Protein backbone atom coordinates (compact mmCIF):
# COMPACT_ATOMS: atom_id res chain seq x y z
CA UNK A 1 0.00 0.00 0.00
CA UNK A 2 0.96 3.79 -0.52
CA UNK A 3 1.65 6.18 2.26
CA UNK A 4 2.14 9.78 1.87
CA UNK A 5 4.16 12.01 3.76
CA UNK A 6 2.31 14.68 5.73
CA UNK A 7 5.21 17.82 5.18
CA UNK A 8 3.17 19.64 8.55
CA UNK A 9 4.54 16.73 10.46
CA UNK A 10 7.98 15.57 8.92
CA UNK A 11 10.62 17.04 10.59
CA UNK A 12 14.36 17.14 9.01
CA UNK A 13 16.89 18.30 11.98
CA UNK A 14 20.76 18.22 11.92
CA UNK A 15 23.45 18.99 13.70
CA UNK A 16 26.94 20.75 12.45
CA UNK A 17 30.35 20.79 14.74
CA UNK A 18 31.01 24.44 15.65
CA UNK A 19 34.37 25.17 16.40
CA UNK A 20 35.01 21.63 17.85
CA UNK A 21 33.53 23.34 21.13
CA UNK A 22 29.19 23.30 19.96
CA UNK A 23 26.66 22.03 17.18
CA UNK A 24 25.35 24.50 15.37
CA UNK A 25 21.20 23.54 14.47
CA UNK A 26 18.95 23.31 11.32
CA UNK A 27 16.41 22.29 9.95
CA UNK A 28 14.85 21.37 6.47
CA UNK A 29 11.10 21.20 5.21
CA UNK A 30 10.21 17.91 3.22
CA UNK A 31 7.67 19.23 0.26
CA UNK A 32 6.36 15.90 -0.56
CA UNK A 33 7.34 12.41 -0.10
CA UNK A 34 5.98 8.64 0.23
CA UNK A 35 6.36 4.87 0.92
CA UNK A 36 5.19 1.96 -0.21
CA UNK A 37 4.76 -1.35 2.28
CA UNK A 38 4.33 -5.25 1.30
CA UNK A 39 1.78 -7.07 2.44
CA UNK A 40 3.12 -7.85 5.81
CA UNK A 41 2.91 -3.37 6.38
CA UNK A 42 6.66 -3.13 6.22
CA UNK A 43 8.34 -0.50 4.06
CA UNK A 44 9.67 -1.83 1.01
CA UNK A 45 10.21 1.34 -1.12
CA UNK A 46 10.53 5.37 0.23
CA UNK A 47 10.90 8.31 -1.48
CA UNK A 48 11.51 12.40 -0.63
CA UNK A 49 11.74 15.96 -1.77
CA UNK A 50 12.90 18.10 0.43
CA UNK A 51 13.15 22.21 -0.27
CA UNK A 52 17.09 23.54 -0.32
CA UNK A 53 15.85 26.73 0.20
CA UNK A 54 14.13 25.66 3.25
CA UNK A 55 17.00 25.70 5.05
CA UNK A 56 17.18 27.10 8.82
CA UNK A 57 20.06 27.55 11.30
CA UNK A 58 18.20 30.53 13.09
CA UNK A 59 20.33 33.14 11.77
CA UNK A 60 19.42 35.08 8.76
CA UNK A 61 22.90 35.92 6.94
CA UNK A 62 24.18 32.26 7.30
CA UNK A 63 21.31 31.39 5.81
CA UNK A 64 21.56 33.21 2.99
CA UNK A 65 25.17 31.76 2.76
CA UNK A 66 23.89 28.18 2.96
CA UNK A 67 21.40 29.25 0.45
CA UNK A 68 23.65 30.88 -2.08
CA UNK A 69 25.73 29.88 -4.79
CA UNK A 70 28.86 29.12 -2.00
CA UNK A 71 26.67 26.49 -0.91
CA UNK A 72 23.93 24.87 -1.25
CA UNK A 73 22.76 27.19 -4.51
CA UNK A 74 19.15 27.10 -3.79
CA UNK A 75 18.21 29.08 -6.54
CA UNK A 76 19.61 26.88 -9.18
CA UNK A 77 18.92 23.33 -7.30
CA UNK A 78 15.47 23.68 -5.64
CA UNK A 79 15.50 20.20 -3.77
CA UNK A 80 17.43 18.25 -2.32
CA UNK A 81 15.68 14.11 -3.35
CA UNK A 82 16.21 10.70 -1.44
CA UNK A 83 15.08 7.86 -3.00
CA UNK A 84 16.07 4.55 -1.48
CA UNK A 85 17.79 1.53 -3.09
CA UNK A 86 17.26 -1.21 -0.47
CA UNK A 87 15.15 -1.46 2.89
CA UNK A 88 16.40 -4.02 5.58
CA UNK A 89 14.03 -5.23 8.06
CA UNK A 90 15.97 -6.07 11.71
CA UNK A 91 13.22 -7.34 13.28
CA UNK A 92 10.47 -5.33 15.66
CA UNK A 93 9.73 -2.24 14.16
CA UNK A 94 13.53 -2.05 13.27
CA UNK A 95 14.67 -0.97 9.34
CA UNK A 96 17.37 -0.27 7.61
CA UNK A 97 17.10 1.75 4.51
CA UNK A 98 20.29 2.56 2.02
CA UNK A 99 19.32 5.52 -0.74
CA UNK A 100 20.31 8.04 -2.75
CA UNK A 101 20.58 11.59 -1.35
CA UNK A 102 21.08 14.11 -4.00
CA UNK A 103 22.28 17.71 -2.96
CA UNK A 104 22.83 20.16 -6.15
CA UNK A 105 23.94 17.82 -8.76
CA UNK A 106 25.67 14.87 -6.69
CA UNK A 107 23.96 12.14 -6.01
CA UNK A 108 25.65 9.63 -2.99
CA UNK A 109 24.45 6.95 -0.84
CA UNK A 110 23.47 7.36 2.67
CA UNK A 111 22.11 4.93 4.98
CA UNK A 112 18.92 5.77 7.65
CA UNK A 113 17.95 3.61 10.84
CA UNK A 114 14.41 3.70 11.33
CA UNK A 115 11.83 2.94 13.68
CA UNK A 116 8.78 2.71 12.39
CA UNK A 117 4.82 3.14 14.30
CA UNK A 118 1.88 1.19 14.46
CA UNK A 119 -0.68 2.97 12.52
CA UNK A 120 -3.61 5.03 13.82
CA UNK A 121 -7.04 5.89 12.57
CA UNK A 122 -6.56 9.67 13.02
CA UNK A 123 -9.32 12.30 14.20
CA UNK A 124 -10.27 12.76 10.68
CA UNK A 125 -11.10 9.81 8.42
CA UNK A 126 -7.46 8.45 7.40
CA UNK A 127 -5.16 5.73 8.32
CA UNK A 128 -2.11 7.49 9.96
CA UNK A 129 1.30 5.89 11.00
CA UNK A 130 4.95 7.30 11.97
CA UNK A 131 8.29 6.85 12.10
CA UNK A 132 11.52 8.31 13.67
CA UNK A 133 15.23 7.82 11.91
CA UNK A 134 18.56 8.96 12.34
CA UNK A 135 21.89 9.14 9.81
CA UNK A 136 24.94 11.05 9.65
CA UNK A 137 26.57 12.52 6.14
CA UNK A 138 29.60 13.90 5.23
CA UNK A 139 28.88 17.11 3.37
CA UNK A 140 32.49 16.58 1.66
CA UNK A 141 30.55 13.53 -0.41
CA UNK A 142 29.17 16.48 -1.78
CA UNK A 143 31.69 19.37 -2.84
CA UNK A 144 29.98 21.29 -0.03
CA UNK A 145 33.50 23.06 1.33
CA UNK A 146 33.48 25.73 3.45
CA UNK A 147 36.67 27.87 4.41
CA UNK A 148 40.51 28.55 4.82
CA UNK A 149 39.85 27.11 8.40
CA UNK A 150 42.21 27.09 11.31
CA UNK A 151 42.57 26.58 15.16
CA UNK A 152 44.72 23.65 15.52
CA UNK A 153 44.20 22.02 12.42
CA UNK A 154 41.06 22.11 13.69
CA UNK A 155 37.61 22.93 12.04
CA UNK A 156 35.36 25.81 12.16
CA UNK A 157 32.69 23.98 10.45
CA UNK A 158 32.64 19.97 10.77
CA UNK A 159 32.08 17.63 7.97
CA UNK A 160 29.69 15.29 9.57
CA UNK A 161 26.34 16.62 9.77
CA UNK A 162 23.94 14.70 11.83
CA UNK A 163 20.57 14.47 11.43
CA UNK A 164 17.46 13.22 12.81
CA UNK A 165 13.89 12.62 10.61
CA UNK A 166 10.20 12.88 12.57
CA UNK A 167 8.29 11.14 10.04
CA UNK A 168 4.03 11.17 9.53
CA UNK A 169 2.32 9.18 6.51
CA UNK A 170 -0.96 9.01 5.47
CA UNK A 171 -3.60 7.32 3.33
CA UNK A 172 -7.58 7.65 2.50
CA UNK A 173 -9.86 5.84 5.44
CA UNK A 174 -10.22 1.90 5.01
CA UNK A 175 -10.44 2.09 1.14
CA UNK A 176 -7.32 3.41 -1.16
C1 LIG B 1 6.01 3.70 7.37
C2 LIG B 1 6.82 4.95 7.43
C3 LIG B 1 6.21 6.20 7.99
C4 LIG B 1 8.08 4.91 6.97
C5 LIG B 1 8.87 6.02 6.96
C6 LIG B 1 10.23 6.01 6.34
C7 LIG B 1 11.10 7.28 6.43
C8 LIG B 1 11.99 7.29 7.63
C9 LIG B 1 11.09 8.25 5.50
C10 LIG B 1 11.85 9.40 5.46
C11 LIG B 1 11.77 10.31 4.22
C12 LIG B 1 12.88 11.36 4.25
C13 LIG B 1 12.47 12.77 4.58
C14 LIG B 1 14.19 11.12 4.01
C15 LIG B 1 15.21 12.05 4.07
C16 LIG B 1 16.61 11.50 3.86
C17 LIG B 1 17.84 12.33 4.21
C18 LIG B 1 19.16 11.65 4.34
C19 LIG B 1 17.81 13.66 4.35
C20 LIG B 1 18.95 14.34 4.64
C21 LIG B 1 18.83 15.84 4.72
C22 LIG B 1 20.05 16.69 5.08
C23 LIG B 1 20.47 16.73 6.54
C24 LIG B 1 20.67 17.48 4.19
C25 LIG B 1 21.70 18.22 4.66
C26 LIG B 1 22.43 19.18 3.81
C27 LIG B 1 23.44 20.10 4.50
C28 LIG B 1 24.65 20.24 3.66
C29 LIG B 1 23.39 20.71 5.71
C30 LIG B 1 24.47 21.48 6.06
C31 LIG B 1 24.59 22.27 7.33
C32 LIG B 1 25.75 23.25 7.53
C33 LIG B 1 27.08 23.04 6.84
C34 LIG B 1 25.50 24.26 8.38
C35 LIG B 1 26.46 25.35 8.82
C36 LIG B 1 26.87 24.90 10.22
C37 LIG B 1 28.15 25.60 10.66
C38 LIG B 1 28.59 25.19 12.07
C39 LIG B 1 28.01 27.10 10.41
C40 LIG B 1 28.63 28.02 11.47
O1 LIG B 1 27.98 29.28 11.42
P1 LIG B 1 28.78 30.68 11.37
O2 LIG B 1 30.01 30.51 12.24
O3 LIG B 1 27.90 31.87 11.66
O4 LIG B 1 29.32 30.80 9.84
P2 LIG B 1 28.62 31.64 8.64
O5 LIG B 1 27.83 32.76 9.28
O6 LIG B 1 29.79 32.11 7.81
O7 LIG B 1 27.77 30.58 7.96
Keep these: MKWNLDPSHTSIDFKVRHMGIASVRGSL ?12 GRPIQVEAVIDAASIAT ?20 PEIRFVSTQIE ?11 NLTIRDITKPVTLEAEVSAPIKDP ?14 NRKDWNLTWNQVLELGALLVGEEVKFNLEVEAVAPAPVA
Design 29 to 40: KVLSGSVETDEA
Design 58 to 77: GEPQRDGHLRSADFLHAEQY
Design 89 to 99: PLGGNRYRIQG
Design 124 to 137: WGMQRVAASASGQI
